[PDB]
A paper describes a structure:
The 19 kDa peptidoglycan recognition protein (PGRP-S) is one of the four mammalian PGRPs which were originally classified according to their molecular weights as PGRP-S (M.W., 20–25 kDa), PGRP-Iα and PGRP-Iβ (M.W., 40–45 kDa) and PGRP-L (M.W. up to 90 kDa). The significant concentration of PGRP-S has so far been reported in the mammary secretions of camel (Camelus dromedarius) only. As part of the innate immune system, mammary PGRP-S contributes to the protection of animal udder as well as to the new borns against the invading microbes. It recognizes various pathogen-associated molecular patterns (PAMPs) with high affinity.
Residue numbers in the entry:
A (entry chain B), B (entry chain A), C (entry chain C), D (entry chain D): 1 to 171
The structure:
Amino acid sequence: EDPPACGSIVPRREWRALASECRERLTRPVRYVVVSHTAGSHCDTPASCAQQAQNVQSYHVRNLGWCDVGYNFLIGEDGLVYEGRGWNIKGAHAGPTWNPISIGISFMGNYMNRVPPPRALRAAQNLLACGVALGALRSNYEVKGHRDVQPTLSPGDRLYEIIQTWSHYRA
Amino acid sequence: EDPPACGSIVPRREWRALASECRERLTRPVRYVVVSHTAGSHCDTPASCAQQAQNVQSYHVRNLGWCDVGYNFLIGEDGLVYEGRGWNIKGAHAGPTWNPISIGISFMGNYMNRVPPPRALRAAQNLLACGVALGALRSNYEVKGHRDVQPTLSPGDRLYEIIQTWSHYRA
Amino acid sequence: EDPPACGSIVPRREWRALASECRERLTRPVRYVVVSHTAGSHCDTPASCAQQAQNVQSYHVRNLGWCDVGYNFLIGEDGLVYEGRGWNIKGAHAGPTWNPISIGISFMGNYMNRVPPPRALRAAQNLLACGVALGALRSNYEVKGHRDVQPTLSPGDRLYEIIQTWSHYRA
Amino acid sequence: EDPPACGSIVPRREWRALASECRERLTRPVRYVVVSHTAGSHCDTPASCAQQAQNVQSYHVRNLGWCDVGYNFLIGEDGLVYEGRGWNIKGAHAGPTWNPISIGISFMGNYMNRVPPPRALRAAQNLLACGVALGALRSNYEVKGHRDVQPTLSPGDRLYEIIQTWSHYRA
Ligand SMILES: CCCCCCCCCCC[C@@H](O)CC(=O)N[C@H]1[C@@H](OP(=O)(O)O)O[C@H](CO)[C@@H](O)[C@@H]1OC(=O)C[C@H](O)CCCCCCCCCCC
Ligand SMILES: CCCCCCCCCCCCCCCCCC(=O)O
């Protein structure tokens, strides 16, 4: 017994998460969400999306020396939310101006020339309220595309377009 | 001016469903939630879970003459909640004493010999979070096993064995 | 058992109860009878007692969100009995240990410093005979005060006192 | 280690409690607190209140076969808090729906006509604050009175009135 919710977020264990070593808390109620893409391989079943999830925490951790997988949360084309660092700690996903005062969610794959399936987007907007319900995120929050806060092609052109049409999106 | 949610549900159009013809509604808010299985094939891709969702609906409609898939909400082994008749329409899931006063949710496949995947209980349990949040269910909704209200083994031995734990189970 | 029997209860429809939404059944014959009080106002007329019956249900179903008023029967001081959940359905009046195995009759008044009138008693003793006559209660049924199975002053010092003299009373 | 944090509760041994036999746990952090009153005599000295604590346990354990005194904590009008089942152990003060998910504090007395003193009221707040600094209560915990969740006059008009003015109060 540790989680009885929330937007049916996969807890660290089901995807084989090596224990975070991160120790900088984020300051709930955060004001920003940054959307990004892993520019990684994509996955469409919960068995490709767990393996691919534990693939990026390991690059971040085996190779980059990081305390934990960079993104606050992760999202696959299979269509569920993967717990990363969470609401509480600070992520490493948008450089030093934003990392502290935002939450980062990353879609799992490259989105320059493909978009993700609706469930993927549905899984995200959900984490959204179930995270405002928690008070991690302000009622009135601003959403930003990775490339809006850092010079990168993240989250891909096709995934970018979509998030521009989100009500909480704000350049 | 207070509620804003709730859930990640594969909508009818998304599983390529046939249109309902059903017109009887339930008085909101519903107090019971009866659980069940399909005793059909199971699926672990979203892809073949939109298929099973469909076959289940097909049987129910084309063979039993029904006005829809009989269940308010279904569940796939891809760890997703599949919409059927939804929160407002009456189901054909548990006979004429219980159908009019409850919401019936049914897992897909046959569950005498497989306890179902863990995400699923999260997905389903989270779906009940919605009903409440929407005022589809009573905050104090009561969860019944199918076997509790019909003379049945269903939702499957393994699985039943599970639901007895929930925080809202009276029998 | 061919020609019976009893009948002194005022039916729901007659005191204009709201629809009971309960579905949990007692196994009959029922061994134990639990005597409680409403801890509110007494009534002395069918009219008053029809309302008083009304309020209690309102408190149980309106406020507390229940399926029906708790008791199986309520005794008014106007000398008549009020069909609560009756003989075949689980009361909610003495906790999960006793509700499956008892009917709960509860006097509608406050009996800490008042004796309920002889008619109310007559009514109550008379109601039990009825239950026996029907196989609703075991012929050797055990009566118990509310305070005896639960922490409360129900059914009152002056009343508790009386039912401790009842032929069917048990420590 | 070394931060604070909480106490000023009279422990079990001190008020000479019978050794508890209760197995069943609670899951922290608990969200709900239900305010009850013992509906008995009040005590205003460490001497008598320790007396009370025991009478009440006796009632529940020697007279009802309960594994432990029903409450998690009691408050005396001596201004002290009496350790009951505590933060970690499911108590028996409000039915099988509130018991597993809440914390039942009982004021030792009867506040239908009487009001509690300042130091009783302060002890209780302090005790909830305590619960929070320890992660036994949820920082945004809800307080409910005993007549909000079960049919009863507990915890006394004048005191019900007061707890409704509490910041954590929720009808
Ligand atoms: C450990 C014993 C406590 C001792 C206290 C003494 C006071 C007793 C007064 C009358 C007794 C009555 O409470 C006993 C009872 O029958 N309780 C619950 C239950 O018994 P079952 O035998 O298991 O069917 O049957 C009911 C099911 O029909 C069940 O629900 C009842 O009590 C509950 O705990 C349920 C809650 O009270 C339901 C209301 C809360 C749900 C949310 C709405 C409230 C508003 C708050 C916002 C969320
Ligand atoms: C209101 C019912 C109480 C818990 C049932 C909610 C079902 C799980 C869905 C979670 C979304 C809303 C948050 C619920 C709180 C439980 C989880 C938590 O607080 O960490």
